[PDB]
Ligand binder design. Structure first.
Ligand SMILES: N[C@@H](CCC(=O)N[C@@H](CS)C(=O)NCC(=O)O)C(=O)O
Ligand SMILES: N[C@@H](CCC(=O)N[C@@H](CS)C(=O)NCC(=O)O)C(=O)O
Lengths: 219, 218
């Protein structure tokens, strides 16, 4: 346990939650540090000069930025137990692909859903559900995306669950009707301690988004 | 006796990445040109979710997204010519800067030759900032990879072939702002793996000019 591990994060961030899940799942004890992104710390600005974003994993004093890159780092350094990625190069390529798909789609469509109006919002909604269906489809059978254990794609994707209430309310939308197997999988993930301890409740996230929409618009 | 096929489109920076990576590893492969305005049935089957090139098809199985396909190449032909560092922290950083390229270069690039106002002026600003950031992250080591071509060189140098177009349409001069950058690009172009893979800037400019007019852009 001699290693020093610090996580710069902000509690409702799905990207931060990824790293939270990955550390828990590996059994890595760490110091969590909360950032106020409207007043970023000098430490965060020094550790992430390029993007000035969280999460930032700091390991023995050295920063690793971009959540999924941090998750692969965690995987490659603490690789003695609990593989979060397949060892077959082709299967690994594919879990990289779907994790990447999550990065491309979910947060951005998501943000469009709760910020935009009219057809822009209407289009964001359709794409959002297609994206989830594709993911749902790739899950198919399997307990988790990673097969029998939590994997890279579960880690990448399940934090967004905590944002679903906000999507649904501001989006005028219902994911469980459209993608029942999806919501089932999320719920299975929430039974794993590494996930439950890492994710905030949808309600707290909703309120966060609500305070954030008012500080912007439309309502 | 591996079968290797590359679905690609000649002026694609993303395709060039895979082109360079295969050359570096000495992998013999079949190149296959796609008309992105009439995508083949094969491409639609191999890349159903994004419907884009490049697609690396290895023993019949597809790998989509260029830098993912480069890591695949690296991990499978791991026998020699390492394209990524072996150290986890260094590999993380290499991944970070390749990601940085993916985030910035192509998109600012497109804004530069499509957008109009001080949107264009903004794009031009960010574009040069990005090149600067990459520049100072470059040594001088000979390459981003150190003494050899690495992941970030592969990720980045294809966009060189787009520089003439960026400059002529952006009203811009990269070698002014970033001479160390342009010098590196030129060192890269001396590697034969880079040279076979990249078309000429003129060829690309002409592509973008015909593409630019067949868009509504004046
Ligand atoms: N690509 C990044 C995205 C991280 C991100 O967007 N973090 C947000 C919080 S949800 C942030 O730090 N925004 C900071 C600022 O631009 O306000 C991840 O995978 O690490
Ligand atoms: N993220 C992708 C982007 C690839 C991409 O954008 N390829 C282009 C050519 S420049 C394409 O296929 N565009 C297809 C479109 O016309 O639908 C890469 O790393 O593989």
């Amino acid at each position: 346990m001699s290693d020093e591990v610090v996580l710069l994060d902000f509690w409702p961030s799905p990207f931060g939650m990824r790293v939270r899940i990955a550390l828990a799942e590996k059994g890595i004890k760490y110091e969590y540090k909360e950032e106020d992104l409207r007043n970023k710390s000098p430490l965060l600005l020094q550790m992430n000069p390029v993007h000035k974003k969280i999460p930032v994993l700091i390991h023995n004093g050295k920063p690793i930025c971009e959540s999924l890159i941090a998750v692969q780092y965690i995987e490659e350094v603490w690789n003695d137990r609990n593989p979060l990625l397949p060892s077959d190069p082709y299967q690994r390529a594919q879990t990289r692909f779907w994790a990447d798909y999550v990065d491309k789609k979910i947060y951005d469509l998501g943000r469009k859903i709760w910020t935009s109006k009219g057809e822009e919002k209407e289009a964001a909604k359709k794409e959002f559900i297609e994206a989830l269906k594709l993911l749902e489809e790739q899950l198919g059978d399997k307990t988790y995306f990673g097969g029998d254990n939590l994997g890279f794609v579960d880690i990448a994707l399940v934090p967004f669950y905590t944002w679903f209430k906000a999507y649904e309310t501001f989006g005028t939308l219902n994911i469980e009707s459209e993608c029942p197997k999806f919501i089932a999988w999320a719920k299975r993930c929430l039974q794993k301690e590494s996930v439950a301890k890492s994710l905030p409740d949808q309600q707290k996230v909703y309120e966060f988004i609500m305070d954030l929409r008012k500080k912007l618009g439309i309502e």
